[PDB]
């Protein structure tokens, strides 16, 4: 006979959607409450209850995900909000009379200038040390009269040192009503179905570390190196590479700085590098040589699959045009470095003596590209020594060539958000639709 309708509540049916997510951290105690808020967050569960699934297929897309935009927005909003009640360095841009450091024939210079005091009529004269990348001449014809770099265009605020910039794990946990699906394929080329799919309460820890031309402290691959992109046959998309074994890298600044605090007004303070005591030397960074050559051999052997079984692979240094996406830029120990990376992509491939790299240091940075804002950085006392696991690579394909088998590769700084795409390519938020209709025989007694 004919059939009737039935409504089911609790049926497993999902639909690709998007929404907001909140913080999730683990129970930890400490000079605390860094820029990433910890007290105003949810303590995660002790053990995540990962649940496996079978006979389930669905699609993915790492270049159209919506979690990375929300993560970037949250990061920038938090970084902006954690700098409002801090000190403002308005009267710092007084003209300078800065001299050379008496090292005969140089990186830093001693500058002396006038500064106010708590009493509105008194004027003191103080001296400090400034790096060569934070000073621009004003006369040029030809005497030495220097000024800062940022207060020709934008304002400047200090970063009072009661907070820290050390990255900490942050779990993104979906609200009640949604779910997250994790793919566990060992050959996930970036887009397409994934056989092994699991459902977890929410993700693991993520270290929001900022880096250019080289990922850091990421997640290691398995059994192979991964070479991912969106479209390989066009020179308009950065190509991501993930290693299978982390390479050790040691950056060091052997100087011995001193923090010198001076008054700038009633209730304010201004820190500077008062003096350098010891040996004036350039901050450097070391990387192992044999492991680097082995990793480059592995990555070129893996990359040969996409460009014919017999081609010439060459590397070249950055093209140029900036100070942030030409060198290798990162932060550690409370200081921002800029280490040249030309001594790495200087080989040519066809068919215990470690490597060294110089590094420069900036203080007045303009990170998180914007207008009207510039963040000063306080100096760190003592010495700094940062060990890291370089794992990633970001490479633009090449320019246009007539015809050959010798295409080159040049590294270039990405869009300051692809660092998280090496960690959020196996996650996807989804909603639940517990309603549905099904046909079968029923006759509800009217009685």
């Amino acid at each position, epitope marked *: 006979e004919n059939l009737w309708v039935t409504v089911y509540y609790g049926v497993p049916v999902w639909k690709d959607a998007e929404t907001t997510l909140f913080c999730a951290s683990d129970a930890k105690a400490y000079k605390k409450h860094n820029v990433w808020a910890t007290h105003a967050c949810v303590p995660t569960d002790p053990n995540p209850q990962e649940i496996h699934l079978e006979n389930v297929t669905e699609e993915f897309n790492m270049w159209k995900n919506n979690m990375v935009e929300q993560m970037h927005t949250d990061i920038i909003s938090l970084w902006d909000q954690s700098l409002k009640p801090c000190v403002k360095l308005t009267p710092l841009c007084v003209t300078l009379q800065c001299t050379n450091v008496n090292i005969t024939d140089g990186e830093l210079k001693n500058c002396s200038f006038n500064m106010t005091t708590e009493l509105r009529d008194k004027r003191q004269k103080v001296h400090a040390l400034f790096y060569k990348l934070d000073i621009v001449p004003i006369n040029e014809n030809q005497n030495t009269s220097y000024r800062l770099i940022n207060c020709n265009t934008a304002a400047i605020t200090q970063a009072c040192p009661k907070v820290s910039f050390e990255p900490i794990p942050i779990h993104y946990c979906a609200p009640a009503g949604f779910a997250i699906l994790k793919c566990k394929d060992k050959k996930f080329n970036g887009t397409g179905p994934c056989p092994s799919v699991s459902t977890v309460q929410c993700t693991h820890g993520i270290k929001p570390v900022v880096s250019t031309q080289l990922l850091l402290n990421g997640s290691l691959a398995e059994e192979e190196v991964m070479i991912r992109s969106e479209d390989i*046959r066009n020179n*308009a998309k950065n190509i991501l590479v993930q290693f299978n074994t982390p390479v050790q890298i040691n950056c060091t600044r052997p100087n011995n700085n001193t923090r010198k605090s001076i008054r700038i007004g009633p209730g304010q303070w201004f820190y500077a590098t008062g003096d350098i005591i010891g040996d004036i030397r350039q901050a450097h960074c070391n990387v192992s040589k044999a492991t680097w050559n082995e990793t480059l051999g592995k990555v070129v052997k893996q990359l040969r699959k996409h460009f014919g079984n017999n081609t010439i692979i060459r590397f070249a240094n950055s093209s140029g045009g900036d100070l942030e996406v030409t060198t290798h830029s990162f932060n550690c120990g409370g200081e921002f470095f800029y280490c040249d990376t030309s001594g790495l992509f200087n080989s040519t491939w066809i068919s215990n003596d470690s490597i060294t790299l110089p590094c420069r240091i900036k203080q007045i940075i303009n990170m998180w590209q914007r207008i009207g804002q510039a963040m000063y950085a306080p100096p760190i006392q003592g010495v700094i020594r940062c060990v890291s696991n370089i794992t990633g690579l970001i490479l633009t394909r090449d320019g246009g060539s007539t015809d050959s088998t010798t295409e080159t590769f040049r590294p270039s700084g990405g869009d300051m958000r692809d660092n998280w795409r090496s960690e959020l390519y196996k996650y996807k938020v989804v909603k639940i639709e517990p309603l549905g209709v099904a046909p079968t025989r029923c006759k509800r007694r009217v009685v």
Partner: antibody, heavy 123, light 105 residues
Framework: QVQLVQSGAEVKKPGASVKVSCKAS????????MHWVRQAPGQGLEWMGW????????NYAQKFQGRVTMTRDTSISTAYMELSRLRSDDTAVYYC????????????????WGQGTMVTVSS | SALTQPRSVSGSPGQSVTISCTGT?????????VSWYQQHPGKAPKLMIY???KRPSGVPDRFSGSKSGNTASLTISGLQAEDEADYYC?????FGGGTKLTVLS
């Protein structure tokens, strides 16, 4: 309106450096790439390179490798193009193109163009 | 490698005309979605049809292209007295030689 203006250039002598400009208006300038293309009189087109005004990251073909420099001044939303050590076969017309409006998300192909400037040299 | 195309093809008023060009299929593969540009004499070129099987806004669809199994073609249906311009095919970065479409006075 979405458009691109340029500045006409005079004939230059061999061994000199040319200065090419390209000024946009309307749409936001720090969101999309910008390419440079050349057209020889009586021949086909040839691509020169592409600059990203957001971060100054450039990439140009190998035919002009080591002879062209591309900069950007986002304070006034203008671009630049320099080229020294010229020859006689570089007599052409130059164009700056973008991809402001298209349904697809890929960088190619570009649709909107500008006026263009014809640069030629005389010994 | 590169894309090639015939230098010039004849055309009569009113008659529908065609232009077809394609290099080696190993680089094309049928999915690069070659575009088509119109180069006017002494003017600024403009896009006639982007990647494939789709027409952009602002241009009439009286003449359009298609992609066969091994060759991309462009059919000009209802030729008129305003088609005196060169036609170029363009890949992501590669370009063609050039085609001229002439009419009879």
């Amino acid at each position: 309106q979405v458009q691109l203006v340029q500045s006409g250039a005079e004939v230059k002598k061999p061994g000199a450096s040319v200065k090419v400009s390209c000024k946009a208006s309307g749409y936001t300038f720090t969101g999309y790439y910008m390419h440079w293309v050349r057209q020889a009189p009586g021949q086909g087109l040839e691509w020169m390179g592409w600059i990203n005004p957001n971060s100054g990251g450039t990439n140009y073909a190998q035919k002009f490798q080591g002879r062209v420099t591309m900069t950007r001044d986002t304070s006034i939303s203008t671009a630049y193009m320099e080229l020294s050590r010229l020859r006689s076969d570089d007599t052409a017309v130059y164009y700056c193109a973008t991809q402001v409006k298209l349904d697809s998300s890929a960088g190619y192909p570009f649709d909107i163009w500008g006026q263009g400037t014809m640069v030629t040299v005389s010994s | 490698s590169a894309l090639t195309q015939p230098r010039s093809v004849s055309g009569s008023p009113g008659q529908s005309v065609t232009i077809s060009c394609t290099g080696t299929s190993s680089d094309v593969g049928g999915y690069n979605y070659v575009s088509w540009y119109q180069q006017h004499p002494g003017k600024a070129p403009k896009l006639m049809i982007y990647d494939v099987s789709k027409r952009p806004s602002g241009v009439p669809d009286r003449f359009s292209g298609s992609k066969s199994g091994n060759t991309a073609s462009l059919t000009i249906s209802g030729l008129q007295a305003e088609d005196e311009a060169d036609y170029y095919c363009s890949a992501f970065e590669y370009f063609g030689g050039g085609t001229k479409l002439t009419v009879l006075s």
